[PDB]
């Protein structure tokens, strides 16, 4: 009779039943497959030194994120190192390329640092003032600073400064350099003659100036440059070089687009009008003896 059927539901039952067993096999195998995390493209190199040069001299060959621990520093910290073929280790402390990071920060934020670090160096940031202080003053040997700019036409220029040091927080992280060392971007830190008062150039120089943020005024203006131009920088009533200013897409901007009617963009008067904001900016230091 009808038993030829009771078979099917066994031929079927026992089949898809075994199939259930082979599925847990492949299932388990998959389980063993989805145990890893996602691979993070950012990695930190294992070499350490007192600065990017030390690290370079130690063998490092590519640019990227490394840990450095200057002499008088009580804690190693991450930095972006620029290493070329000639084996030079530029310890980069500032970077601008797209208006990604907001530079209108406070004293603590500038002292500690903000923004992010990328191995590709395609990231905007400001290493801590303290960090910069430690690095540049860590030892006898003197440092050199290379300001590197780029407009919106692909052109790039630089300004070098010798004996670059940054005072301690007790002295408002004062900026001090022995002298301009040339560069096609000019010496904006020497101040700039704008035309009005015969002190234009004097009041816009930076050598010797102390750092200022909106919440910690140390500029030479009876007002607050840092607060108006809305940034953190070595103000002096106010500036001729302002690499920490507002990012302006396309470079060109007016005194109209400005909050207070004052040029607060990323300027370098000795290379471009104060109404033209750089497209990319770089501030990096390297032991002086590395250039000759």
């Amino acid at each position: 009779t009808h038993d030829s059927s009771i078979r099917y539901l066994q031929e079927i039952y026992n089949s898809n039943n075994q199939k259930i067993v082979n599925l847990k096999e492949k299932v388990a195998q998959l389980e063993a497959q989805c145990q890893e995390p996602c691979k993070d493209t950012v990695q930190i190199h294992d070499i350490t030194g007192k600065d990017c040069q030390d690290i370079a001299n130690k063998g490092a060959k590519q640019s990227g994120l490394y840990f450095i621990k200057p002499l008088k520093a009580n804690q190693q910290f991450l930095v972006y190192c620029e290493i070329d073929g000639s084996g030079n280790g530029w310890t980069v402390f500032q970077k601008r390329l797209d208006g990604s990071v907001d530079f209108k920060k406070n004293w603590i934020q500038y002292k500690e640092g903000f923004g992010h670090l990328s191995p590709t160096g395609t990231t905007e940031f400001w290493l801590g003032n303290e960090k910069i202080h430690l690095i540049s003053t860590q030892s006898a040997i003197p440092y050199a600073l290379r300001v590197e700019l780029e407009d919106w036409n692909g052109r790039t220029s630089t300004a070098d400064y010798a004996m670059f040091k940054v005072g301690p927080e007790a002295d408002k992280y004062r900026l001090t350099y022995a002298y301009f060392a040339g560069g096609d971007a000019g010496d904006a830190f020497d101040g700039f003659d704008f035309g009005d008062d015969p002190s234009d150039k004097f009041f816009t120089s930076h050598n010797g100036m102390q750092f200022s943020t909106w919440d910690n005024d140390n500029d030479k203006f009876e007002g607050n440059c840092a607060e108006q131009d809305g940034s953190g920088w070595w103000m002096n009533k106010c500036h001729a070089g302002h690499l920490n200013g507002v990012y302006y897409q396309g470079g060109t901007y007016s005194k109209a687009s400005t909050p207070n009617g004052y040029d607060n963009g990323i300027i370098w008067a000795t290379w471009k009008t104060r109404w033209y904001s750089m497209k990319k900016t770089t501030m990096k230091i390297i032991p002086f003896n590395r250039l000759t």
């Binding site: 700039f192 704008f194 009005d196 008062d197 002190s199 234009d200 009041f203 816009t204 203006f221 007002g223 440059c225 009533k237 106010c238 500036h239 001729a240 004052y262 040029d263 300027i267 008067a269 104060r274």
Partner: peptide, 4 residues
């Protein structure tokens, strides 16, 4: 720039 300069603040007169």
């Amino acid at each position: 720039g300069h603040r007169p």
